[PDB]
Chain A
Amino acid sequence: VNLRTQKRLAASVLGCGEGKVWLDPNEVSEISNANSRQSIRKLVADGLIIKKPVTMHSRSRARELNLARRIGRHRGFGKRKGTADARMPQQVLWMRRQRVLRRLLVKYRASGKIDKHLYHELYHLAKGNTFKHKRALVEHIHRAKAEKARERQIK
């Protein structure tokens, strides 16, 4: 009783690997008499041939590890294998900061809080690395507006 052909045909019919095909060991004679794909489909319908479910692979532990690192665990100096630039590129950080600062300057110019000359000056300062972040840029804008208002009041 050889069922290599039957296992290959059942794998082709069920659309799975040959390691996922289950042949009923109590009807090996009936499976042997099944010699075509139609007979294989009839045995699948009758339940003599079953596709086994997939071997278990869970991502649970990866999910609690992701949540723990999101909270801030497993981030110490003994958990790092790459350089600081390798984990987080400072060029990428500078690109994100420049895009944030330019977006804020464009929004302020569109809203009308600053004019074109102050916009150009702050654009070149942000390019020349005067501002670390958006809060610093907003504080400098407010301080420049306040000193301009003081100069206008003096004049």
Chain B
Amino acid sequence: KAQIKQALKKLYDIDTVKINTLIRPDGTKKAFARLTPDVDALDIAATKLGLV
């Protein structure tokens, strides 16, 4: 989680309050990063993450 939050901060200028992690049944890792209330996940996903 410490590496994941640094990676998010260095890549997308994303600051996270907390991060949960699980390991999926196929073997990859899924991370739920909850943002600060001062930023909008809709705005970040629309501008940077391209998830519309």
A and B in contact, CB less than 8 Å: no
Query: Residues of B at under 8 Å CB distance from A?
Result: none
